[PDB]
Amino acid sequence: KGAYDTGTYANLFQRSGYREDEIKARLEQTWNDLFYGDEHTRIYYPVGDDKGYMLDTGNDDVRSAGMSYGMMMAVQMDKKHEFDRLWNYAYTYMQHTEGRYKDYFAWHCKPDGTRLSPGPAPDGEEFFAMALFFASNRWGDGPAPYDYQAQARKILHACLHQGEQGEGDPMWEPSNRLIKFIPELPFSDPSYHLPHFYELFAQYANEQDRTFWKEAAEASRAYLRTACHPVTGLSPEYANYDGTPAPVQLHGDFRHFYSDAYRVAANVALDWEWFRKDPWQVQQSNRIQAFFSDIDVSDYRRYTIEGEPFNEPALHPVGLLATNAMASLAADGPDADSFVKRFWNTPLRQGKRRYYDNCLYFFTMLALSGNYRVYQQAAA
Ligand SMILES: O[C@@H]1[C@@H](O)[C@H](O[C@@H]2CO[C@@H](O[C@@H]3CO[C@@H](O[C@@H]4CO[C@@H](O)[C@H](O)[C@H]4O)[C@H](O)[C@H]3O)[C@H](O)[C@H]2O)OC[C@H]1O
């Protein structure tokens, strides 16, 4: 049985020989540096009396995925002030109040809140909902727009039902229960599959949707089994419903192991830790750690899912190492402990591309310290 059932979370840093006091100090200093550090480290900026944003430093914009990550980090760290500022920002500037995308979030805006595209990014919506449910379960709801569980249910209603009221498209394909890359296109993104979150949407969503969320959890576990290369454990950034790499798109080649796909190993391992349902997740974690076992972080490239290295370097190599280390939540192979130590000995990334690395870095810091947790509906 998983942490969801037992309430006990693996502390892999403590398992590797780091002291309890060292671990929680390091987690606190990671929070301090990311949220309130120097101009070359921080990725969070407070705005006015009641708002705040996570900055994609590399792209000079604010992303629904980054905002939703910030909210997950804040609720996992018991930081209600930062949580409320981030949510109020996403609510005020990014959430559609009308049209084909009503209740969805414009995927990016300028720091001042000016929308740069109207279309959503479904990985944002699902993290928003999960963070909002945890905020409800930890702190209890407030007055709108801080009625956390009501806001979460509204997002997930749109995610399954959007094209019914009028026009628009759902973010889940009804026929196969799989999350889509965007509402309009019939393919997916393996990194967007969060079966562990769907298990919890099955507990918290609008009642009529709970069966679908349960089916989505199993469908996503099965999908990820089809998406990861059987030898390397590498997955493509964009993939067809059959799990094979999607066609080259107008905005890029997403067929290879690069930025998005790093999260797959981290997501697979967190589902293992929380629910312990699919033993393939141990083997997947072993395989990706074996692929990177004698690759130094300084040599991380773009790779074909078959494991062929490009000359082109990984844009986010610290992100990749963070996700490789987070796989130690599930891995039982010879590389598990080495990756925890390698991650411990890695500082936060600095400079203009640091945002994506440091997001993945923070989730790994939470997970490997036993602090990436389910906040349930339970007796106080
Ligand atoms: O009309 C359509 C557009 O709206 C559509 O936009 C897509 C919306 O989702 C976007 O996905 C974002 C991109 O960021 C991902 O993380 C990035 C990983 O690479 C890093 O370098 C970067 O810092 C990160 O931000 C995030 O998971 C996801 O939410 C996608 O890129 C857009 O293409 O595109 C097609 C139009 O037809």
UniProtKB/Swiss-Prot annotation:
Thermal activity characteristics from the UniProt entry: Optimum temperature is 40 degrees Celsius for the hydrolysis of xylotriose.
Molecular function as annotated in GO: oligosaccharide reducing-end xylanase activity
Pathway linked to the protein: Glycan degradation; xylan degradation
Enzyme Commission identifier(s): 3.2.1.156
pH dependence: Optimum pH is 7 for the hydrolysis of xylotriose.
Residue stretches in coiled coil: none
InterPro entries documented for this protein: 6-hairpin_glycosidase_sf (IPR008928), 6hp_glycosidase-like_sf (IPR012341), Glyco_hydro_8 (IPR002037)
Pfam family, one: Glyco_hydro_8
Keywords assigned by UniProt, alphabetized: Carbohydrate metabolism, Glycosidase, Hydrolase, Polysaccharide degradation, Xylan degradation
Top-tier EC class: hydrolase
Reactions this protein catalyses: Hydrolysis of (1->4)-beta-D-xylose residues from the reducing end of oligosaccharides
Domain of life (superkingdom): Bacteria
Active-site residues per Swiss-Prot or TrEMBL entry: 65 (proton donor), 260 (proton acceptor)
Biological process annotations from GO: xylan catabolic process
Function, in words: Involved in depolymerization of xylan, a major component of the lignocellulosic substrates. Acts as an exo-oligoxylanase that efficiently hydrolyzes xylooligosaccharides, releasing xylose from their reducing ends. Hydrolyzes xylooligomers of 3 to 6 xylose units to xylose and xylobiose. Besides linear xylooligosaccharides, also hydrolyzes branched xylooligomers, such as xylooligomers decorated with 4-O-methyl-D-glucuronic acid moieties. Its proposed role is the degradation of xylooligomers produced by the activity of extracellular xylanases once they have been transported inside cells.
Family membership noted in the UniProt record: Belongs to the glycosyl hydrolase 8 (cellulase D) family.
Protein name as catalogued: Reducing-end xylose-releasing exo-oligoxylanase Rex8A
The organism's taxonomic lineage, starting at the top: Bacteria, Bacillati, Bacillota, Bacilli, Bacillales
Gene encoding the protein: rex8A
